[PDB]
Amino acid sequence: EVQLVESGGGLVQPGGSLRLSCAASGFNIKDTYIHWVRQSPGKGLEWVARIYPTNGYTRYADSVKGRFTISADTSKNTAYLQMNSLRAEDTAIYYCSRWGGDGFYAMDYWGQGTLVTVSSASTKGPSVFPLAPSSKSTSGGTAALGCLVKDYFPEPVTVSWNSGALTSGVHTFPAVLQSSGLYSLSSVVTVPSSSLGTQTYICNVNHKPSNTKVDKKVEPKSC
Amino acid sequence: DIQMTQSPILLSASVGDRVTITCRASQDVNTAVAWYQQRTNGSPRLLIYSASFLYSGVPSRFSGSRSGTDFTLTISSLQPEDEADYYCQQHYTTPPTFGAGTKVEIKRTVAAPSVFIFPPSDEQLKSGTASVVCLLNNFYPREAKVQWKVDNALQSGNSQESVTEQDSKDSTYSLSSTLTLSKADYEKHKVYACEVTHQGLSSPVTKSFNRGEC
Amino acid sequence: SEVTIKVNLIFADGKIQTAEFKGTFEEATAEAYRYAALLAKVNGEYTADLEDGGNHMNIKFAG
């Protein structure tokens, strides 16, 4: 199974430096080209750099030349992107991909990607509040409940329900940027009304940039 | 450099329809064009390479063609899981470049939302801010108007909306609207109401609570 | 400035798709007619009726 895994993304100040890694498995990077491609609201999908690890030949996008360098360690089957003199415009998901793999002249495997956020704002962990089910969140024998994940920076946060065992009826809303410059989102799930009180419902919230891990049990209110 | 111009930017069609999306290179790229799909929460996935060749594992309902500098991606029988963005990319010259993308949406029958409301949690009310959440679940089409009223006064500028992408199972949308007040303001008023206007409803639906009620 | 041309694609068998083209009015217009011509190859001769100052199009294909 071919796999590429990016790591190293995170919050960095303008002018700052970051180094990304791209760990390959299931194939040898000496047999292919390895690319970095980024994706942003401002420019969409934008090629960044490439390397041919068996001879070290590299090419770069004009907008990053001199500021970024690509490299590869074949003994670790890993490629790297050094990112210096970072600017707001470099804020993006960074993917690594391979090209020419199995003779296919396209980028046929891409990693999950890693987000780089270039900003002078500080890391902030979220507060997690229950959205308790109530007489105002039920109809037709089913009920909605959720978690409000408020005031965090930077992205991302992840939310699951019951350690991932609960996926049906879940809606985790896109994050919204508040006027404060902090993000917020809610995740809700619709369940049988009859399960409230007998089935435990927990939202598992993780904000790695702040090392925030919260497991919030959501139940009906007291009255 | 070479640019790739994709059209249309948005295409909406019913399940089973044949859909066509296009991509024009600013100069000759021979056949060196690939098509990628990006599903919600996903990375780009290769569908077609060298203009017309299907990548392994890709459903045969996908096909690609080239005429000069014009490239097409066709889906012969649109499936709910084809709901995604599609991107073309040339690799004829460095830098390789991508099109701006085409968003493909699924048309389905009208469905009115289930409308719910959530007071601020007592936990949140310990610390000076109050978030009131209005939830619109599993509706179609996407267009909806959500208005907030506090003690019957129309609110403006103090709410934000978020909408999910189309559901995998039923092609619907859900939406949250969050009203944000100081705790002091929240405790000063009584009636909190969300009014929802949507094509599937015969008239607007108001979901309300009095602060302090069970 | 930036405009959106909204198009109804009306096929001979009654099926309807919708599409949007964005750009300057002139760019979006050129792209919409181009797209119509391309679909016409497979779906039959097209007719384009414009409304809203040309910002909306109903494009019907003959089959």
Partner: peptide, 13 residues
């Protein structure tokens, strides 16, 4: 349409 990190999807206006 504009790409959004949160969904990894284009959002149209």
């Amino acid at each position: 349409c504009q790409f959004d990190f949160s969904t990894x999807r284009l959002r149209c206006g």
